[PDB]
């Protein structure tokens, strides 16, 4: 599995779904389909949290990484599970949408990098040891 691909496809899907553009994301399949379906379902179930986050972020170029780090720490404070990983992807999608809304499209490239590195370094061992994306697909696909 390729975490950069997973992030790129997911962000492209979310942005395209809501009418936003991301130049660098213009373009195993089972993981991408499962992740985007899970995230759509999460956003429907927690739509109030989704709207609240969308309206409160108030991003700027110098604060975006801190907003990202602050939410991700809180999201995982009580431990990682697959639903919190889906929530992390959905949050990354909100950060990207809000970046364009604030006329800061270049931040989408940064956020995709931060998500990828989070998967590659912080979440990597938990994901591997709890069965990888294959287990996520068996559970929720
Ligand atoms: C600063 C903040 C921290 C403040 C708080 C919040 C918001 N909070 C974040 C944590 N949150 C969680 C966490 C874990 C779970 C969970 O059950 N965990 S679980 O048992 O592992 C699991 C259970 C089911 C599925 N799948 C169902 C399938 C149904 C058929 O279709 C395929 C999927 C999965 N799964 O991984 O797919 C995994 C969960 O409940 C669900 C319920 N339905 C779900 N559907 C998909 C995922 C999911 C999770 C919800 C609640 C909302 C913040 C916030 C704000 C905006 C954005 Cl944008 C983001 C975050 C920021």
Residue numbers in the entry: 9 to 35, 90 to 203
Sentences from the paper on this structure:
BCL-2 is the founding member of the pro-survival class of proteins that includes BCL-XL, BCL-W, A1/BFL-1 and MCL-1. Venetoclax competes with pro-apoptotic BH3 motifs for BCL-2 binding, releasing pro-apoptotic proteins and allowing apoptosis in cells primed for death.
We have now crystallised and determined the structure of venetoclax bound to BCL-2 at high resolution. We obtained crystals of BCL-2 in complex with venetoclax that diffracted to high resolution (1.62 Å) in the space group P212121 with one molecule in the asymmetric unit. The electron density for the drug was well defined and the binding pose was in general agreement with the published structures of ABT-263 and compound 1, with the 4-chlorophenyl (CP) bound in the BCL-2 P2 pocket, the piperazine bridging the P2 and P4 pockets over residue F104 and the azaindole substitution bound in the BCL-2 P4 pocket. The structure reveals subtle differences between the binding of the drug relative to the published analogues, which would not have been predicted based on the previous structures. Venetoclax selectively inhibits BCL-2, thereby promoting apoptosis in cells refractory to conventional apoptotic cues.
